[PDB]
A paper describes a structure:
[name] is a transcriptional repressor regulating the expression of the multidrug ABC transporter LmrCD. In the apo state, [name] shows high affinity for the promotor region of LmrRCD. This affinity is reduced upon binding of a drug at its drug-binding site, enabling expression of the multidrug transporter. [name] is a homodimeric protein with the drug binding site at the dimer interface.19 Central in this binding site are two Trp residues, W96 and W96′ (residue 96 from the other monomer), oriented face-to-face at 7 Å from each other.
The [name] protein contains two unique Trp residues, W96 in the drug binding site and W67 at a solvent exposed position, approximately 30 Å away from W96 and the drug binding site. Thus, W67 is not involved in drug binding. To investigate the importance of π–π interactions for drug binding, the electron density in the π electron cloud of W96 was modulated by progressive fluorination of the W96 indole side chain. By our method, all Trp residues that are present in a protein are replaced by a Trp analog, thus making the system most suitable for proteins containing a limited number of Trp residues. We obtained milligram quantities of pure, labeled protein, which allowed, for the first time, the crystallization and structure determination of a set of proteins labeled with mono-, di-, or trifluoroTrp. It provided detailed insights into the effects of fluorination on the binding interactions of the indole side chain.
Author numbering:
A (entry chain B): 2 to 68, 76 to 113
B (entry chain A): 4 to 113
Write the structure that this text describes.
Amino acid sequence: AEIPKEMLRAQTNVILLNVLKQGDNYVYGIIKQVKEASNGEMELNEATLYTIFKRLEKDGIISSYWGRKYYRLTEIGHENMRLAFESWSRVDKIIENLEANKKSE
Amino acid sequence: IPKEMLRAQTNVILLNVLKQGDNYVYGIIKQVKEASNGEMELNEATLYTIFKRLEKDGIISSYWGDESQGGRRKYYRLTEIGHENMRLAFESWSRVDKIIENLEANKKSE
């Protein structure tokens, strides 16, 4: 009953982007805030954040600066989150229709 | 929309088709086409690519179903492991939504 590793990575990506949507942040603060928001259950480790942030920065989704290193969501990242939400909204409607077409038949 | 994102979405849709009930490839494509109102017309070869991986991982299997109009179709089905993975996905993704809600609430506090 463990969550698949690929799925966990997808979830961790979403959580981190939503933290940075809250505001610019540093790794220690992010990990601490996620721990608080998860009632202590989700304790992310630095190594996973550094891997993820390197990719998000490469894809232009986030940027960084010294101010420890602070991270922020770019305009590209905000737009990408908007398009993802819209695209997954349409998927939710497809699944709803599959269920309704089932019950109808 | 990124190619990876489309693949993740196609995976979830196909698993949800099979959760509704066992089906064969032409039937699956038709049900997705109808449920997307024509917006998603999957090609067979993409399903075979995805189904090869899902069968390798024990998430789906296949069997021959005798058709009452004559002949046979290859049916795909979600396995007991596949059903459990979908249950854990729903629970863990639901929890992610709650964490994000909490991050926002903890934000407004200050």
